[PDB]
Amino acid sequence: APAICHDGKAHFPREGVFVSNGTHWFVTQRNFYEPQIITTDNTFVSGNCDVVIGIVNNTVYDPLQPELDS
Amino acid sequence: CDVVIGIVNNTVYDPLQPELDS
Amino acid sequence: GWTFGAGAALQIPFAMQMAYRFNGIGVTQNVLYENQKLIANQFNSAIGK
Numbered sequence: 858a859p860a861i862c863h864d865g866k867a868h869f870p871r872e873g874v875f876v877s878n879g880t881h882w883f884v885t886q887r888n889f890y891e892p893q894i895i896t897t898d899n900t901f902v903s904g905n906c907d908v909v910i911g912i913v914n915n916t917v918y919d920p921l922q923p924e925l926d927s
Numbered sequence: 928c929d930v931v932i933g934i935v936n937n938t939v940y941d942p943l944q945p946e947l948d949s
Numbered sequence: 950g951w952t953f954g955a956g957a958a959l960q961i962p963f964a965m966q967m968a969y970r971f972n973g974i975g976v977t978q979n980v981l982y983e984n985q986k987l988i989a990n991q992f993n994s995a996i997g998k
């Protein structure tokens with residue numbers, strides 16, 4: 858997929874691309890297979906979702922939520 | 928830490944620590 | 950893309966390759982998508998000349 862839409866905002870990978878074996882979505886580097894969980898760290902936000910062609914609805918995870926409880 | 932050879936124990940700071948009181 | 954020169958050919962969508970080639974010169978790749986149509990119509994036009 859080119860990008861992922863969460864709340865109308867469109868996200869892009871900091872480096873590498875998104876893939877999925879059907880079960881879940883992942884972000885990986887270019888020359889070697891090494892998936893990692895999607896995050897607001899290795900992604901960035903720019904513009905709304907409507908403009909881009911071929912976007913896919915999903916959810917972006919934020920690791921700060923479990924930590925801010927303490 | 929299992930695979931890489933020469934790995935060393937050390938304390939890693941986190942900027943969240945001073946402000947975790949929120 | 951470039952990969953077939955390096956080793957075996959790997960399929961890749963064309964818009965993705967355009968985005969990479971934009972990264973190659975220092976323009977954040979999102980700029981490509983929010984203008985895709987426009988760029989295309991220039992390419993087909995320019996080659997026409």
Ligand SMILES: *[C@@H]1O[C@H](CO)[C@@H](O)[C@H](O)[C@H]1NC(C)=O
Nearest residue numbers: 858859910911912913962964
């Ligand atoms: C790929 O082709 C199908 C058939 O037209 C189209 O529905 C789909 O939008 C295309 N996928 C992307 C990301 O453009």
Ligand SMILES: *[C@@H]1O[C@H](CO)[C@@H](O)[C@H](O)[C@H]1NC(C)=O
Nearest residue numbers: 929930931932933934935936
């Ligand atoms: C570096 O070389 C010395 C001598 O062979 C050896 O004792 C030591 O294990 C080596 N250092 C590491 C981290 O392996």
Ligand SMILES: *[C@@H]1O[C@H](CO)[C@@H](O)[C@H](O)[C@H]1NC(C)=O
Nearest residue numbers: 928929933934935936937938
């Ligand atoms: C590094 O941390 C682990 C976990 O406590 C410990 O077992 C290990 O002994 C430490 N390494 C050294 C050289 O002490």
